[PDB]
């Protein structure tokens, strides 16, 4: 029918939304699915329309819309940038992070064994004994953070970390969190 400038701009917008939303799922997106769920009667002018989606998609959000296999009839989103709480990073550092993590979470102090059975699960004994030389303080086998770390990380960062594992961070944090912020403020002076 009669489609104004905006009717169309709205359509491309709709499409770039569709794509954006899907790519999160790393689907990948089907041209027919694109056609059923967005184009409707605007099919006649689609290729030009797609072209626009593609460009806006690239230009405003910096995503390259790409068919993944030639003649796939299927598309995906590629990040043009750029690219990318503690960071090709070391293997052990993750481990540590987890551990210094555990420690923050159960009241800044935790017994040994309990973690250990639970840890192998996911060089244990020896690496964590030497973790002590630097990052750790252990008595008897109770655990605390140890001096080295606070110079290298924060209660907040450890939080961001434990956060990112499940994602989020309001819920496991709030209890802990409040000090973590009282630490962020503590860090200013």
């Amino acid at each position: 029918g009669p489609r104004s400038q905006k009717q169309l701009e709205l359509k491309v917008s709709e499409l770039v939304q569709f794509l954006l939303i899907k790519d999160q799922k790393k689907i990948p997106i089907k041209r027919a699915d694109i056609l059923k769920h967005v184009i409707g009667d605007y099919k006649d002018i689609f290729p030009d329309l797609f072209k626009r989606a593609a460009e806006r998609l690239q230009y405003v959000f910096g995503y390259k819309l790409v068919e993944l296999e030639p003649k796939s009839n299927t598309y995906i989103l590629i990040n043009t940038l750029e690219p990318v709480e503690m960071r090709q990073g070391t293997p052990t550092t993750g481990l540590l992070m987890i551990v210094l993590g555990l420690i923050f979470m159960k009241g800044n102090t935790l017994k040994e064994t309990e973690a250990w059975d639970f840890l192998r699960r996911l060089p244990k004994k020896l690496i964590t004994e030497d973790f002590v030389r630097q990052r750790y303080l252990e008595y008897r086998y109770e655990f605390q953070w140890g001096p080295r770390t606070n110079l290298e990380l924060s209660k907040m960062k450890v939080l961001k970390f434990v956060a990112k594992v499940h994602n989020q961070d309001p819920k496991d944090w709030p209890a802990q969190y409040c000090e973590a912020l009282a630490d962020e403020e503590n860090r200013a002076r």
């Binding site: 701009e9 709205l10 917008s13 709709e14 569709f18 910096g62």
Partner: protein, 236 residues
């Protein structure tokens, strides 16, 4: 308008996140600059810029403020009215319909909160293929994880983000059940009402309207104001 990689990367992030509080978006804005090292515009000026290359998409980085304590949030929101779809795309038919049903309850609810149990009863109603309460309890956590829903004490309210996204939709769809603040005049999900009127206003609105006033009086009807006046938001 002049777009930079810093701007696109901001948008990429702002989206993977549903919504962000003011400081987190400046923490963000600055991040993108430091990751792209120049002078960093007043976050406010930065945004307006972007919002302006967005016009042709008829979508905007929108600033809003929470119904529980008036924190500033920002989401990427559609100016197009029929925003059933940002979620329509994200979830299953049955999941979407569960949201509807839940939203439907949040609105009628005097509180703007609905019990989990009241919601789950609606599970046999659900369109788009049978699910069970177990499955349903997860999905509700999904909506929470994605900032469409908020929970307090096994009850659920719309997330600020939800409102920013779908206010349009909602009002057009539930005109006789929606509530609007005086003052703001915007959609209002939870807030204080007057006992004499039936007037309602968002907490933060009640905070500001009666700010520094020793005798808060109901604006319409001027009766004495029955509820505790919140102290307006400030960075602390």
């Amino acid at each position: 308008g002049v777009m930079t990689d810093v701007h696109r990367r901001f948008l990429q992030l702002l989206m993977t996140h549903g919504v962000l509080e003011e400081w987190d978006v400046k923490r963000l804005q600055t991040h993108c600059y430091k990751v792209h090292n120049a002078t960093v515009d007043k976050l406010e000026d930065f945004i307006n810029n972007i919002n302006s290359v967005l016009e042709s998409l008829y979508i905007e980085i929108k600033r809003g403020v929470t119904e529980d304590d008036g924190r500033p949030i920002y989401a990427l929101v559609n100016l197009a009215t029929t925003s059933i779809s940002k979620m329509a795309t994200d979830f299953a038919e049955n999941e979407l319909d569960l949201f509807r049903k839940a939203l439907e309850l949040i609105i009628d609810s005097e509180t703007g909160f609905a019990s989990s149990t009241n919601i789950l009863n609606l599970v046999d109603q659900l369109k788009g293929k049978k699910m069970r309460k177990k499955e349903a309890e997860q999905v509700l956590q999904k909506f929470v994880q994605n900032k469409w829903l908020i929970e307090k004490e096994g009850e659920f309210t719309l997330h600020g983000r939800a409102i920013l996204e779908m206010e349009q939709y909602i009002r057009e769809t539930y005109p006789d059940a929606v509530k609007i603040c005086n003052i703001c005049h915007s959609l209002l999900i939870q807030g204080q009402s007057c006992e004499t009127c039936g007037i309602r206003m968002h907490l933060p609105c009640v905070a500001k309207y009666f700010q520094s006033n020793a005798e808060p009086r109901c604006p319409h009807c001027n009766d004495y104001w029955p509820h505790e006046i919140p102290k307006v938001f400030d960075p602390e």
